[PDB]
Amino acid sequence: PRGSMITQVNQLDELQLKDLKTLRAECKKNDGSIPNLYIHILKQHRSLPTSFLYYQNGALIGFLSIYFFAVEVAVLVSPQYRRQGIAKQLIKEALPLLIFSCPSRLNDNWLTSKGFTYLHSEYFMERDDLNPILIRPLSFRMATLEDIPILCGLDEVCFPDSVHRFQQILNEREYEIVIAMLNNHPIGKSHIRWQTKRATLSDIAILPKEQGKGFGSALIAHCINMILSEGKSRVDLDVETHNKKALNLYIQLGFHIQNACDYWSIN
């Protein structure tokens, strides 16, 4: 009680950042997944004091932060000190001034009972198998700037400023987009962000009318193989869903869940 301290901090200096990662690892090991913390964000000054740090005897045991992108609340309490009022004190420090990101399966029963509402879930998946995948009537090509109409059309029906977003992606050298063609019709796309040791698939879209035919799996399998041919040892994948049933697609291709969050809401 004497040794318990809450500091409201407009931006995390270096040392505060290193303590958070200690707390994150600890929560990661105990819960399996962690909330979104947005580390690169936590370093910038903002207009109101945003991150809330709970210390016990100088040791960080709780953290709550608010993000301005609606508002996203991330809350993290050391397993040793849970159910002792810590999160409750932490939101009050942010109540006079809500989308919670939540480790999948941890808090499902009691979030409903209080009147939270489930939005959707996000998954970071990883495929570490170095063996390729080993046949649909699809061809593939890399998108260019002259594919902007196609790319905007696909994004319109699969994720209801697209022109300039795709202009920005296509002009960034770490990014490429693969287009899937059914005969002479583009029916899908996948974005690749390349790094030295790995590459990340995102924004995978198949036209609604062409779904259920294996084109999605063929597209991702093509991107996996393309990544392995370049000597990467890992394919990552970010996908947002409303239902867990949707992940079997990626489980079949060798992806494993590395992190999983459910976005819940309240006011």
Q: Which residues are annotated as a binding site for CoA?
A: 75, 77, 83, 85, 87-88, 107, 110, 203-204, 206, 211-212, 214, 216-217, 238, 246, 248, 250
The closest residue (CB) to ligand COA is 216
Render the burial of 200-231: b for 16+ CB within 10 Å, e for the rest.
Answer: bbebbbbbeebeeebbbbbbbbbbbebbbeee
Instruction: Give the residue among 220, 165, 162 at the shortest CA–CA distance from 188.
Output: 220
- Please provide the distance, in angstroms rounded to a whole number, between the alpha carbons at the two ends of the chain: 30
Interactions with ligand CLM, residue window 9-38 (CB under 6 A): 36-38
Cα(203)–Cα(205) distance, integer angstroms: 6
Residue 86 or 227 with smaller CB distance to ligand COA:
86
Tell me the closest approach of the beta carbon of residue 77 to ligand CLM, in angstroms: 17
**Does position 154 bind ligand CLM by CB under 6 A?**
no
The residues with which 179 forms a beta bridge, in sequence order, are 141, 189
Q: Which is nearer to ligand CLM, 84 or 258 (CB)?
A: 258
Distance, CA of 199 to CA of 127 (rounded, Å): 10
Spatial separation of the C-alpha atoms in residues 267 and 257, rounded to whole Å: 31
Answer for which of 5, 25, 39, 157 binds ligand CLM (CB under 6 A) is: 39
Please state, as a whole number, how many other Cβ atoms lie within 10 Å of the Cβ of residue 176: 18
Report the SS3 class of residue 250.
Answer: helix
Looking at 122, 147, 203, 262, which residue binds ligand CLM (CB under 6 A)? 122
Annotated binding residues, as ranges? Answer: 75, 77, 83, 85, 87-88, 102, 107, 110, 114, 203-204, 206, 211-212, 214, 216-217, 238, 240, 246, 248-250
Residues that bind ligand COA (CB under 6 A): 27, 31, 35, 75-77, 82-88, 100, 102-103, 106-107, 110, 158-159, 202-206, 211-217, 239, 248-249, 252
For β-strands 175-182 and 138-142, DSSP reports them as: antiparallel
In the list ligand CLM, ligand COA, none, the entry touching 69 (Cβ below 5 to 8 angstroms by class) is none
Contact between 260 and ligand CLM by CB under 6 A: the answer reads no
Supply the minimum distance, in Å, between the C-beta of residue 196 and ligand COA. Answer: 23
Going by C-alpha positions, the residue among 72, 39, 93 that lies closest to residue 264 is 72
Helix (H) or strand (E) holding 21: helix 14-31
* CA atoms within a 13 Å half-sphere pointing along the CA-CB vector of 264: 24
If the CB atoms of residues 117 and 139 are measured against ligand CLM, the closer one turns out to be 117
Residue 77 site contact among ligand CLM, ligand COA, none (CB < 5 to 8 Å, cut-off depends on kind): ligand COA
Which of ligand CLM, ligand COA, none has residue 38 at its interface (CB below 5 to 8 Å by kind)?
ligand CLM
What is the binding site for ligand CLM (CB under 6 A)? 36-39, 122, 238, 240
